[PDB]
Every structure is written in structure tokens, then in C-alpha cells.
């Protein structure tokens, strides 16, 4: 899509429609005449394009109006209202730009932000841009949170986020033009390699992949069409649903075997009845022929009754010989109507052991994409975000994803090594108490108008709590925290002296032996400039490999690789790293999934701020004081960098609207 309609799409908005967010601010326009809406819409899109065309520099309300034309550049309160809404919600001038109008010398409102994950950083940058006094508290000794980039010598490999999932309407698209990230495209090609160490052949490969996607569509049909969504009071998982489909496929394989072998019997049994008939005819014949012989003994000449006798018996013998000819005829049709069916059995099994194994690898691919046992994902909703896929080739950040949070961190007040312990929010303000992770008795307190909590969901999840809210978060929020899923996935990084794999290929499966190990080192990546291979540990395996040492892991890795490229083509790895996200106390996992009995709507509850009770009773309703951003809070873009980055933008907008007010709604 291109022009001003490209921009609308590249900023994730309908180019010819006003969004529910716009209605909110422009209810004059959207409840008014069509004509104006289109003017509005244009102004919007136009502006978007401008910022998009050049995101290394700030887009001012002047610069905008300059480059508009009549009739559009005619109403300036409109233009202004639009430009300001855009800027407010981070649709323009987000990320890293040269400012023209240097910063508001004195600040307004004060905000503490928990965590310098990307959601964190993105929100800070906004708030600071909006003239606010912003400080972030990171427990770790680096920014970037779950964007971890391993660096040593020339080796570079993310144990965290690693891929940009297409630039097609991706905020990261913008960020990438603003920051020296080096984006290589990932080539889609992916050979699998069963346990033995030898490729699966195109034949199988394709027939199984196709059956897998066939089995997905299926589950979906159970969900929406058949409404199969509760099972003895428990929400139905995707895992379960897949089984129920697989069974019903195994069953029909048998129902078919049964009926085809039942045609055989119903037939082979006419044959019986006919063979019988026929054997009783050879009987009456044999004996009739006897009789006619006896009657041709009576040598001529002979009285007529005796002559009649021969003739009679003759006709009778011929009659019966017609008949047995007609039956030998029949016998002949059925006799081949059996070498018929017996030649076309139906299919023998539903799927073989070699099949069900490759099919597993396809389930590992799901578990990796949802960082969880499919036994846990919601049937109705696991994929509830699919409509918002980006377009274009997925990509890697050849100089390491960290390069981004770090970029975003510049200009910012970030207290590193500071572990929030308590959030205290009240009608008149908030204080956050944090310790120093080095010497923990050493205490800190921050007073602020507002707190933005970007705590990872696994953190928010700790029993017993690692962070205490004072007062306790209302039950609607904590239930959302329980209901939601926060999964796990790990990475193994392999550094070598030399490339010993297919240089022109970026990924390649390893099919496991069991259902149980389906995710164990199931997938490898040749992504980087240096000789580095990287392998996923996913599904059930993820959780259990954390309990195993690095060597015993790197072993199984080398094992598999030898297995695939030959025992002596695979050298001892110079450097090795192994992620353990569930263990990591500042993650307690890797990213969220919609768990069974959750919906996408829970993500919405994650984002709803908290408004304290009043101090003095009978005093009016307070401002909201506790806000949340982060991958677990963005229904439309869960579990991802852009998703987070986007929630950061979102809260910063909402908080600024709250404490600096919004001049654009008038």
C-alpha cells in the first residue's frame, strides 16, 4: 500500500476510517458530516506519511502545516488538534529523533517507571519528551530486559528477542531507520532431520506438514462450529483438542477398514451361495446323464414311450446345462470382483511412527511460538491476535537486538541495580521502595505522582510476591494475573572456529524421538555473521532443561549436529551460552500466552490503571495512579518487542493525558 494510504496502514490504521481512539478525541468530527471526516482522515494520513518519510527528525506543527495544501491547510485548529493527538499517542515523533524545539527547561509531574525493558524505555522517552520528570528503576545491571544480547569477541547472539516479524506496519520498521540495526532477511527454507541424522524426504515432509495444518483448521472448526469449549467444566486446551481430532482421524481410518472388509464378506458370501447352487447342479446333472445313458442302451427299434424317454432326458440335460453355464458365467464376475477389492484396500494406519514423530516437530513449532505446552494454550483464543500479523520477510538484527534498548536508553535517568520491593500509591501520590541488588539492606524511596509498572508477568505472578502493592491490587486485576499464561522458552548458543553447516540456509529442524522431547533442541539458526548456530529448547522440554547443566546440554547439541553433518565435521565449540528464563528472577519466564480459560480480553485488564480509594472519606474520586505497560498488556501484539514498545507508547500517552491534560479534545 502507498501514498497517504501507505502511511495509515504502516501505522496500523484504516486509511478510510476513523478508529475508536479517534472518535474519543474528535467526537465533533466523527458524529458530524462525512465531508469533514475525509478532510480529517486525510490530514491524519498526510501527517503520518510526513513523519514516516523522515523519522530521524521531529515533526512540528509548523513543518506539518507548511507542507499541507488547500483545502486541507486551511483550517489550522483542525491541523493542530490532529498533529497534537498524533504526537500524544506516539504515532509521530517516537523513538529517537533530533528535536528542533529543545526541551522544556522546567518539568511538570514526576513519574517512576518500574523496569527498563523496552516497554519501559519507550514510555520514558515519551514522557520525557512530554516534559515530565521521569526515572526508571531497573533491577538488572543493563537495560533492555528480555532483550538480551550475548557478546564476546566477535560473537553476537540474542538469548532474548531475535527476530523482527516483518516491517509491514511494524513500529520497529520506524525504529530501524532511526537506529543502526543491521537487518538481514531470513530465508524461509527449513530442512528437517529425524533422529537418525538423515533428512526427511520432500515426499513425507510435505505430506505431514499438510496434515498438521489440516489438523489445525480442524481444531478451529471444533471450537467455533461445534462449540466444543468446555470439558467436564474445564476449558478445553488446544493440546487436548488436537488429540480429539487425531483420535477421530484414527477412528475413521478403522471405520473404513471395517466397511471395505465387510464388502469382501458380503460378496465372498454370494459366492458361497452360488458355489453351493452350482455343486447341486453338477449333482442333478451327473445323475441325469446316468439316466440318459441307461436310456440310450435300449437299442432300437423302440416303442414311442421309450423313444420319448431319450429325447425328454436329452432336453432336460440341455436345460440344466444352459443353467450351469449361466452360473459359471456369474461365478466369473464375482470371482474377479474379489481380486478387485483385495487389490484396493483403504489406508492401513492413520499415521506411522515416523509420521507422528515429524508431526510432533510441528507441534514443537507451536509450543515455541507460544512458549508453552499446547496442553495449556486456550483453544478458542490462543491465536486471537492473528489478524494483526505484519507483512514482509521476518528479519534478524545482525548486530544484536540489545543495540536497541541501549539506543533508547540514551538521554534517560535510569537507576540500574535497583529492585523495587514495594509500590505504595494513594489518593495524594505514590512512593516506591526499592533496594540495591548488590548490598540489599541498603534502601531507596521514590515519591511520584504516578507509577508505570512494566514488571514481567511472571514477576507479577510470584507466589509469594516479589513486589508488594500497597494497597493490594484489586481482585479483578489479580485474577487476570492468575488466569493469563506466562510461558517459557530457552536458547542454546554455539560458537565455532568454522562454518560446518549449510551457509546458505538459516534454519533447520531436528525431529525428536518421543512426543515428550518434541521441543528439545528442535530447531537451529544460522543467522549471524560469525560462525554461530543457535538452538531452541521449547515446550515441556524448556522447563526441564533448566535443571540440567550447560555441558550435558551442549553435549546433546553436538550429538545431534554430528548426527547431521558427520562426527568429525562438528568441532568442540569455542564459546557456549544457555538461557534459563523461568529461573531468572527478573523474568520468571519468557513471554505470555493466552492460557486455557483466559481470553485476549485479559490483556485488556492488564492494561487498566488502578485508582486509589480516597484519603479523607467523602473527598471526591481520585486520579488513577498505577499504570501498566508491557508485552502482557497489549491484546493486539502480545509476547513481542514491537508489542511492548507499543504498550509503552500507549501508557505514556494515557498518563500524559492525565497529568498534563489534553488540549486537543476541545
Amino acid at each position: 500500500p502507498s501514498g497517504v494510504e501507505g502511511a495509515a496502514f504502516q501505522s496500523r490504521l484504516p486509511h478510510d476510517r476513523m478508529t475508536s481512539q479517534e472518535a474519543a478525541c474528535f467526537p465533533d468530527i466523527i458524529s458530524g458530516p462525512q465531508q469533514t471526516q475525509k478532510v480529517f482522515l486525510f490530514i491524519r494520513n498526510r501527517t503520518l506519511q510526513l513523519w514516516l518519510d523522515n523519522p530521524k527528525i521531529q515533526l512540528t506543527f509548523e513543518a506539518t502545516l507548511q507542507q499541507l495544501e488547500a483545502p486541507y491547510n486551511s483550517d489550522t485548529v483542525l491541523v493542530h488538534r490532529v498533529h497534537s493527538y498524533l504526537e500524544r499517542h506516539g504515532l509521530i515523533n517516537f523513538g529517537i529523533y533530533k528535536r528542533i524545539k529543545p526541551l522544556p527547561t522546567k518539568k511538570t509531574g514526576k513519574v517512576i517507571i518500574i523496569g527498563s525493558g523496552v516497554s519501559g524505555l519507550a514510555a520514558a522517552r515519551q514522557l520525557q519528551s512530554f516534559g515530565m520528570d521521569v526515572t526508571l528503576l531497573e533491577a538488572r545491571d543493563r537495560v533492555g530486559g528480555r532483550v538480551a544480547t550475548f557478546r564476546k569477541g566477535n560473537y553476537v547472539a540474542d538469548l532474548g528477542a531475535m527476530v523482527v516479524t516483518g516491517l509491514g506496519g511494524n513500529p520497529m520498521a520506524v525504529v530501524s531507520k532511526q537506529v543502526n540495526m543491521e537487518l538481514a532477511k531470513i530465508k524461509q527454507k527449513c530442512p528437517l532431520y529425524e533422529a537418525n541424522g538423515q533428512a526427511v524426504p520432500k515426499e513425507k515432509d510435505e505430506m505431514v506438514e499438510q496434515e498438521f495444518n489440516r489438523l489445525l483448521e480442524a481444531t478451529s472448526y471444533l471450537s467455533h462450529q461445534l462449540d466444543f469449549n468446555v470439558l467436564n467444566n474445564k476449558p478445553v486446551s488446544l493440546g487436548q483438542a488436537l488429540e480429539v481430532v487425531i483420535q477421530l482421524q484414527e477412528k475413521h481410518v478403522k471405520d473404513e477398514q471395517i466397511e471395505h472388509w465387510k464388502k469382501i464378506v458380503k460378496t465372498q458370501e454370494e459366492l458361497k451361495e452360488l458355489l453351493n447352487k452350482m455343486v447341486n447342479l453338477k449333482e442333478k446333472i451327473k445323475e441325469l446323464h446316468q439316466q440318459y445313458k441307461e436310456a440310450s442302451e435300449v437299442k432300437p427299434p423302440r416303442d414311442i414311450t421309450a423313444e420319448f424317454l431319450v429325447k425328454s432326458k436329452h432336453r432336460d440335460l440341455t436345460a440344466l446345462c444352459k443353467e450351469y453355464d449361466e452360473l459359471a458365467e456369474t461365478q466369473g464376475k464375482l470371482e474377479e470382483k474379489l481380486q478387485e477389492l483385495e487389490a484396493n484396500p483403504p489406508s492401513d494406519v492413520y499415521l506411522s511412527s515416523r509420521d507422528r514423530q515429524i508431526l510432533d516437530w510441528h507441534f514443537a513449532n507451536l509450543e515455541f511460538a507460544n512458549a508453552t505446552p499446547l496442553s495449556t494454550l486456550s483453544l478458542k483464543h490462543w491465536d486471537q491476535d492473528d489478524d494483526f500479523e505484519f507483512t514482509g520477510s521476518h528479519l534478524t538484527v545482525r548486530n544484536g537486538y540489545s543495540c536497541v534498548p541501549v539506543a533508547l536508553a540514551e538521554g534517560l535517568d535510569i537507576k540500574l541495580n535497583t529492585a523495587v520491593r514495594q509500590v505504595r500509591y494513594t489518593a495524594s501520590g505514590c512512593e516506591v521502595i526499592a533496594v540495591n541488588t548488590r548490598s540489599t539492606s541498603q534502601t531507596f524511596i521514590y515519591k511520584c505522582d504516578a507509577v508505570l509498572c512494566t514488571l514481567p508477568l511472571g514477576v507479577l505472578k510470584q507466589q509469594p510476591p516479589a513486589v508488594q502493592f500497597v494497597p493490594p491490587l484489586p481482585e479483578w486485576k489479580t485474577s487476570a494475573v492468575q488466569r493469563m499464561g506466562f510461558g517459557n522458552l530457552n536458547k542454546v548458543v554455539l560458537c565455532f572456529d568454522r562454518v560446518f553447516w549449510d551457509p546458505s540456509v538459516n534454519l533447520f529442524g531436528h525431529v525428536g524421538s518421543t512426543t515428550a522431547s518434541r521441543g528439545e533442541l528442535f530447531l537451529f539458526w544460522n543467522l549471524y555473521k560469525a560462525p554461530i548456530l543457535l538452538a531452541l529448547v521449547a515446550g515441556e522440554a524448556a522447563g526441564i532443561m533448566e535443571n540440567i547443566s550447560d555441558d550435558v546440554i551442549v553435549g546433546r547439541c553436538l550429538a545431534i549436529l554430528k548426527g547431521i553433518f558427520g562426527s568429525s565435521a562438528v568441532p568442540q565449540p569455542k564459546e557456549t551460552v544457555v538461557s534459563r528464563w523461568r529461573a531468572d528472577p527478573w523474568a520468571r519466564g519468557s513471554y505470555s500466552y493466552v492460557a486455557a480459560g483466559s481470553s485476549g480480553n485479559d490483556y485488556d485488564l492488564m492494561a487498566q490503571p488502578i485508582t486509589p480509594g480516597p484519603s479523607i472519606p467523602g473527598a471526591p474520586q481520585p486520579i488513577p495512579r498505577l499504570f501498566f505497560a508491557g508485552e502482557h498488556t497489549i491484546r493486539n501484539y502480545p509476547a513481542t518487542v514491537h508489542g511492548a514498545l507499543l504498550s509503552g507508547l500507549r501508557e505514556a500517552g494515557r498518563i500524559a493525558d492525565q497529568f498534563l491534560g489534553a488540549m486537543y479534545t476541545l
Partner: protein
């Protein structure tokens, strides 16, 4: 509106594989057994019929009589007339047979005869006795 093609997912079946924990493995055995039960039955009749096949060995070859080829004639030698009367006793109205027996008369002459000699050969009587059997 429908599953993907050749996937089979009726309401009815769904319920019967869910009803309990191994209601899945139950039904998949009833079938595995049904199948073996039929599979042996197959060999049983395959065995029964192989035995009946061997009893028809040689076919009906030592029982076939070559062909009487003879020119259909018009006049009724007393011989032929008598063959007739007796065929009638034995065949009733099976004109085809009566014609086959008499050797050289069309299925119609045979019919004609019936009206022609009706009185002389008490064909009324003869035919009523064919019915007494």
C-alpha cells in the same frame, strides 16, 4: 460451514470420544476387534469356498452332448405326433421344450398343433393331468 476435506467430525462422534478418559481407547479397541473378527470370518469363507471350488473340478465337460442340427419341418409323422402327446403330458405349455423334444418343430407349429388335434388327442384331458402334478 464444514471441516477441512475428508476430516470426519460429526457432533455424535465427538461426544463418544470425550465421554470419559479412555472412552477414546475403548472405542478404538471395539473396532480393532470388530476388524480381526471380520478378518478371520473372511479366511473362513475363503476356506469354505476353496473346498466347493474343487468339487466343481472338470466342470461339466464329461456331460455335454454335441448338437442336433436339424431342419424344421411342416408335416407330422405319426412318430412326431406321439412324441408330442407325451411331451405335453410332461411339459404342459412349455412350448419351447415340447419343440426341443420333438426335434424339428417351431414353437408355433407346436402351438398350432394344440388347436389342431385338440379333440383327437384329448389335449384338454392331457393338460389337466399335467396340473395334477
Amino acid at each position: 460451514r464444514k471441516p477441512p476435506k475428508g476430516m470426519f467430525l460429526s457432533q455424535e462422534d465427538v461426544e463418544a470420544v470425550s465421554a470419559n478418559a479412555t472412552a477414546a481407547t475403548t472405542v478404538l479397541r471395539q473396532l480393532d476387534m470388530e476388524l480381526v473378527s471380520v478378518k478371520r470370518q473372511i479366511q473362513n469363507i475363503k476356506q469354505t469356498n476353496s473346498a466347493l471350488k474343487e468339487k466343481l473340478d472338470g466342470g461339466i465337460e464329461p456331460y455335454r452332448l454335441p448338437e442336433v442340427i436339424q431342419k424344421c419341418n411342416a408335416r407330422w409323422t405319426t412318430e412326431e405326433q406321439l412324441l408330442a402327446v407325451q411331451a405335453i403330458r410332461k411339459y404342459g405349455r412349455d412350448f419351447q421344450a415340447i419343440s426341443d423334444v420333438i426335434g424339428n418343430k417351431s414353437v408355433v407349429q407346436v402351438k398350432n398343433f394344440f388347436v389342431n388335434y385338440r379333440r383327437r388327442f384329448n389335449i384338454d384331458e392331457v393338460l389337466q393331468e399335467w396340473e395334477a402334478e
